[PDB]
Amino acid sequence: EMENVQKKLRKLERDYYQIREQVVSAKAGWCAVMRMVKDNGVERRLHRRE
Amino acid sequence: SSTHIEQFMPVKLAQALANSLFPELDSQLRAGRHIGIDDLDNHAFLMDFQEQLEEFYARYNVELIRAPEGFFYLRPRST
Amino acid sequence: AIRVTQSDRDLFKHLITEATSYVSADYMRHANERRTHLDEALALRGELFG
Amino acid sequence: TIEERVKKIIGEQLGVKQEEVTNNASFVEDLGADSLDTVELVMALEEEFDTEIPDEEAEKITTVQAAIDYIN
């Protein structure tokens, strides 16, 4: 059973790697907007948590 | 139908140009005078037909402009 | 005086409200996609470690 | 190199200047990276060098000097 579960573990590992790469790529792009919205435009006006 | 003001001009614009205040105002405006809130007659007139006047003067390649403070004036284009 | 000010106000308000509606919506869309993928990555990470 | 690949990752994951990121520059107070920003920073550090880090030992890292110390 532990061997059988380790195969599930490895599937999860590959999935996790893919998701990791995608998340990092998103952050890289979003950084530019953050540097650009330092004008005090973000604090409340743009970031409407509602 | 034919021979009808609407064929050539909007009714409100013709109504404005036919007013007794127009020649004075026109003359002045062309000369560069600014119009504020104190000269009621003129100011009110301007307010009533703003868009028609703007459209009119546009023919000349000049903008009839309204500053935030409520005063009107003429700004010519390069052409 | 009234006739002036009322106008001015109308234009101000309309531009403000529509522009914020137009921009904030997509800004939050992006933020939410990034949040979602990060959350999925963290759940995968924790489950993999355990 | 590792000691400048760390800067490559940190600057482009927090958007701060290369000059700002010194060895002792802490992420939260100097670089301003908050909870999720630091999470993404550690994820990027993992990806760059294709390694993995424990949860507690990773969260212990809260500075450029500490970042390199665990990296190198």
Resolution in A: 3.9
Subunit contact D55:C49, Cβ cutoff 8 A? yes
Q: Which tokens sit at C32?
A: 């939410």
Experimental method: cryo-EM
Q: Is B79 helix (H, G, I), strand (E, B) or coil?
A: coil
Q: What is the dihedral of CA D55, D60, D66, D67, to 10 degrees?
A: 30
A20 contacts D40? CB cut-off 8 A: no
Distance CA D3, CA C36 (A): 32
Q: Where are the domains of chain B?
A: 5-76
Task: Compute the distance between CA of residue D28 and CA of residue D39 in angstroms, rounded to an integer.
Answer: 11
Task: Give the chain C residue nearest A6 (alpha carbons).
Answer: C48
Residue D34 appears among annotated catalytic residues: yes
- Other beta carbons within 10 angstroms of residue B35's beta carbon come to 19
Asked if D23 and D65 touch (Cβ cutoff 8 Å), the reply is yes
Size of interface A-D (CB pairs under 8 A): 23
CA distances in angstroms from A6 to A3, A16, D39, listed in the order given: 5, 15, 27
Q: Which residue is associated with the tokens 């107070």? A: D29
B34 residue type, one letter: H
- Please give the angle made by the CA atoms of D50, D54 and D59, to the nearest 5 degrees: 105
Domains of chain D: 1-72 (1.10.1200.10)
The token pair at D12 is 């482009």
CATH number for the segment(s) B5-76 = 1.10.10.2250
Residue B64 main-chain phi, psi, to 5 deg: -80, 105
Show the beta-strand stretches assigned E in chain B. Answer: 62-66, 72-76
Q: CB of D11 within 8 A of CB of D17?
A: yes
Distant-in-sequence, close-in-space partners of B40: CB < 8 Å, separation ≥ 6: none
Binding residues of C for (R)-4'-phosphopantetheine: 42, 46
